[PDB]
Write a protein that binds this ligand. Structure first.
Ligand code: GCO
Ligand code: GCO
Ligand code: GCO
Ligand code: GCO
Ligand code: MN
Ligand code: MN
Ligand code: MN
Ligand code: MN
Ligand code: MN
Ligand code: MN
Ligand code: MN
Ligand code: MN
Lengths: 393, 393, 393, 393
């Protein structure tokens, strides 16, 4: 292992700072000081730290307290060299956000959420963040008639497009990244998966600077294939940031360390981030952000153990995935299975729809029964990936 | 109840024609003749019938057999007055489609699937169908390294855009509707949910004539809110057709009658189709297609019972949903909950992002603690919908 | 439908007292005085109230304080007539319980947990409770090597049999009801479904006074049929108590009002509680207790509304379920479908295994193809159930 | 890793013989001769073979035919040395079984089903099988009013105890293993998880020779922890047989190769089969049987590859799991985390309930806040497990 700043491992302040309060209990750990957080993270090899406004500045802080807090925060960063690649806003914890921020049924709450976002964009720019994340955790319902579903999407669009136009207007060097989640805390959250968030961006006025922030556990809560979903985000040129962690099944958001959930899927997620596609195409080159929470049963030694473990897991997987694609038995297994063949266009250069209809050999004279005998050998190809993952090859 | 042709209830030939073979067993019923199917459906009050190419014409039929089959098929339609509003292609049952049609790793299978589609578009136009459905049931994988994920999306786009351009080229009065499904028969299917299919259409060249065909059970297999998902399809002006049925949970595709799954959700799905949105907006005005399968434990009297039951359920729900929105106690409950308030824009006419930042009353001077006391009364609003559904109000 | 004490509607103090704090936010409501809870519940028609030791008496309460609180609560009960049918222990909120109470890895903690339970049994006995519920919420793990799994079950048995032995020794009229939950707060909880609960009971020294307390949402969190699960509990004569609420899918514990989740499943649970089994069998006669949470979006008028909605939902489903079984049309459908034939023993009186194998009629000359023609008509029977539920009959 | 008969790897004839037909398509492979299956499995290192009556002898086979087939199969076994450790009955493919075998609503069908089982017990006894498996796949319903649920369990008990009584009367060395499945082919299956299976067993007249046959994918279809479920079965001494395969989430039964689904859960099941419980306890000693299906995409080279992959996966996980527990670092972590402390009884020898309540140290003066400071370090122990699994240690 041994991580270093060129690995681009970023951690949020609320991950290691998570004190243990869940739905059935109180915090099991003492609050973590943010200057301490910076120092410890930089000592482990992180490249940067991210935060929610209220993670650093209390909802209630006076103007004087904000500047005291920020001064110490900026010095620590200076002292350590940590960057601040992403900033986000808390629009879910205070009781006023109980029906949402942007899609709140109450118009005056909608304005208060939008103004909270606009000011946070100014702090984002001041920190040097390149990405502004939006997780609409209270946007949704428990009951289907609680909302006008079309109106709720117009209210999401107005917030996002107002914030985008403000970036554009001030010339900040920022992009917005929406973060999908199917449920929790709302029974149903608007833009529940990667797909829904991607579709939504194409209806915006300022869509050009809006992309996604997929999170491993979140798509797994709908039982979806995380690698498939980020592949589609990537393919669309919309993969602006990523949140890595672990989930074991369809249940509450667990936020385990990356690799302590669905292991095989974590492997293939690292193969796509690191290696990209077999035939060539787009590559994700942003930071590798860890959005997890250290288990409440463990003390502060577990908090720092857990932060090291995110980084170890990703470097271990990376290693096995570089060996796997490099392996000449794998390259030949891939060629047998048609992996490279999928990269050839279906139509010949210049062929038209009529052309192919009239080509006797692709339809009228085609031997469907003989084409069906092909052994794709997908099981053998899967067996080679796992043996590479078990460090057996 | 009593359905009639202006209700626009359509049924596929494979629904009532489904003989009972599942994964653990053989058919429990005798094949159903398609001319018989037409006659029985028209006697029950259906408006039209849909089919998959191989539902009517065997994979193997000679040219002479196709014309014999079609002649009897067109006469029956003539004799009864049934329309053929949608046509689809089978790209999943024959062994050649074991890795897909359009995204098959084998290039020669990809061409054979595209040519099967092109010819089926010609038959679609000849029948008077307005919608051409695409369900990519074998497009996917069991193993994550079986495919180049970016290449698979380029191969889906080439098929869909070739077929779209062919419609455009021939001037057919047809639209393509993609049908999402998360898994089954593939471990992971490409375009698994409504969101993924919507996003995918915005990357097409001929996107303008491509929309969706959501199916109740399919989004429920990812645990998603069906009403939320069709609302987003509707909002985007992409809801071209719909498949109605029932699913009880995350498991194999059940295809129960509409209303024999998640009942409350079926109610709200009928409220959106029939009533549209509380504040006004788009409306779905196409056919109400039933994609279900009569339970294998029941005989042919159950097949026709089951077909009547789809229609009864939808008319019963429609009735309760018209009474519910008409109810002045509901209208007032809605007004209390902020349902109409969500329709007001957040920003005042002419207000800019800077304006709102500088409005002291929406941020600096806002009383967050007092705005948080609002009783949204969503529980009471839900209680009134259910009492309307139980026929208690 | 107006509930009367006769109905046996019970509520926990923690249900209407839930303040609204979840994993992503703070409480939206002020604390509820217990005296008020009791008077309010008495005015809505409740039969009784239930609590957890610490819902009433704080963890750190001095003796003078405990005494005061108890005097206020017993006063309230005397004034209103409410019964206290069940009492339970909080073995999950204090940080000491982060790895469980009975199955904590630390033995000193296991001893405290058990001491905490014994004292609470004393109190339960003084309040006149007939049921003692155990919900082991922190018993389990996030990771598979965290526990010696055979030892976790011995530890569980030790605590549960010590509690049972103490009851018996003291002569208290109390029975223990175990409550399953598959996950949350722990990634995996021991004794996760009704089945595991019932199995464990059979390995107990004192299993005769140990039974189950199934909760609607908890079985639905694993996707199981709640009506099937309570029928196995009844069939084993082990249905001691029941917790009713609603759950809309596989996700975090929603604790919605009973009937506000899966509606048809609620219909059929009410039928089973009220009508018993179609061929006869045991019947459940305890409290109809609701363990739900008033959505956090709602203010105090919402709290009493939701409390009320639980009892109306139940009464409304009861009216329909009684009508359903009293309908002649329904009885005829049940007979046709073989619902009373299931009650006839397969063998003849004094017919042995050998006698049957040798009966030629049942095996060797049985006409399987003819027997397979039966039209069970399950679809039509389900249609009739739903038409009774929608009150269209 | 090369399997030897010593390993006890068993395979069903139906596993490598699966032809590829699913609900959406026809078979992609030709039928497998049983003689060949036996010789092929013998050359890969299998210990034994298993079958369903009709996998071998067709439903309609004449006596001369049955005799031939049996002569060919016994020849093969004599030639290769394969054992036949388990035999089962097909009570699900023929249309007669559309509502179940033992719990069919039709009594004539219940009698046939039971006759079919008795005859198969005879055969199982002649083949030298030690285990008789029952998988009640059609036992259940799609709709909640289809069954009298108490009567369904009496019917189940009647069949299972008749089969058990017959074994005992005939003096056969056979034990019955019940196999749970939550859904598919039926919407809801009776005895859906290990827990329900174990519970039912305790109501049986002859439960002493009746145990369980859990299948990896089946418990994962309800989202349960397979390793936790088999540990309860072991703890009750009721783990008679096991079926290994892989499942990637809550969906249709995938029947993937063991290790090709949830990898860490497979690691920890292998640890439990091989290392037993950390503090000691019962150990499983039967066959390691694989009930999977070679993906239908793959031709016959894929079939033998997949058969082989099952035994390599298992051997590879075994090597890692043995190394994991033998590591000193791991043993130290286990001790710290309190894995051996769980094995110490909570009470002291001859310490009663009263003695404990009165012990001041355990209750009244227990320092809960100090006890809560323990760092269980479960994260670090899980990290060590995964590093042994990836072979980076
Ligand atoms: O605990 C929290 O603060 C949230 O879970 C976040 O981690 C969100 O998932 C989102 O990434 C940023 O708001
Ligand atoms: O059984 C089938 O023929 C399929 O399940 C269809 O019903 C698809 O869902 C799709 O709508 C049309 O191909
Ligand atoms: O909210 C709570 O305090 C708990 O969730 C309980 O309600 C459990 O569900 C159990 O029924 C009683 O401990
Ligand atoms: O494919 C099959 O024939 C069945 O699914 C079986 O394999 C069951 O899973 C059970 O283990 C044996 O009846
Ligand atoms: Mn998360
Ligand atoms: Mn996140
Ligand atoms: Mn379907
Ligand atoms: Mn469909
Ligand atoms: Mn609950
Ligand atoms: Mn409960
Ligand atoms: Mn299986
Ligand atoms: Mn099996």
């Amino acid at each position: 292992v041994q991580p270093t700043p060129a690995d681009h491992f970023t951690f949020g302040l609320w991950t290691v700072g998570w004190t243990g309060a869940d739905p059935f209990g109180v915090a099991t750990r003492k609050n973590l000081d943010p200057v301490e957080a910076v120092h410890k993270l930089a000592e482990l090899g992180a490249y940067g730290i991210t935060f929610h406004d209220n993670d650093l500045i209390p909802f209630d802080a006076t103007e004087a307290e904000r500047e005291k807090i920020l001064g110490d925060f900026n010095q620590a960063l200076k002292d350590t060299g940590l960057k601040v690649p992403m900033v986000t806003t808390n629009l879910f914890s205070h009781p006023v956000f109980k029906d949402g921020g942007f899609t709140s049924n109450d118009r005056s709450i909608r304005r208060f959420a939008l103004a909270k976002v606009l000011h946070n964009i100014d702090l984002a720019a001041e920190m040097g963040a390149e990405t502004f994340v939006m997780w609409g955790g209270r946007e949704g319902s428990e009951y289907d008639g609680s909302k006008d579903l079309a109106a709720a999407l117009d209210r999401m669009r107005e917030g996002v497009d107002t914030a985008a136009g403000y970036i554009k207007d001030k010339g900040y060097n920022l992009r917005i990244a929406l973060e999908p989640k199917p449920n929790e805390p709302r029974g149903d959250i608007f833009l529940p998966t990667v797909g829904h968030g991607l579709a939504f961006i194409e209806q915006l006025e300022h869509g050009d600077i809006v992309g996604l922030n997929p999170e491993t556990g979140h798509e797994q809560m709908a039982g979806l294939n995380f690698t498939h979903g980020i592949a589609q985000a990537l393919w669309a040129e919309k993969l602006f940031h990523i949140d890595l962690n672990g989930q074991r099944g369809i249940k509450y958001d667990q936020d385990l360390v990356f690799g302590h959930g669905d292991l095989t899927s974590a492997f293939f997620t690292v193969d796509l981030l690191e290696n990209g596609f077999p035939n060539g195409g787009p590559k994700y080159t942003g930071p590798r952000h860890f959005d997890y929470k250290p288990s409440r049963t463990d003390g502060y030694d577990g908090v720092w153990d857990s932060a090291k473990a995110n980084m170890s897991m990703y470097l271990l997987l990376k290693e096995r995935a570089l060996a796997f694609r490099a392996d000449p038995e794998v390259q030949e297994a891939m060629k047998t299975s048609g992996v490279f063949e999928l990269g050839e266009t279906t139509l010949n250069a210049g062929e038209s729809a009529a052309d192919l209809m009239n080509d006797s050999a692709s339809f009228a004279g085609f031997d469907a029964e003989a084409a069906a005998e092909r052994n794709f050998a997908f099981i053998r190809l899967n067996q080679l990936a796992i043996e590479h993952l078990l460090g057996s090859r």
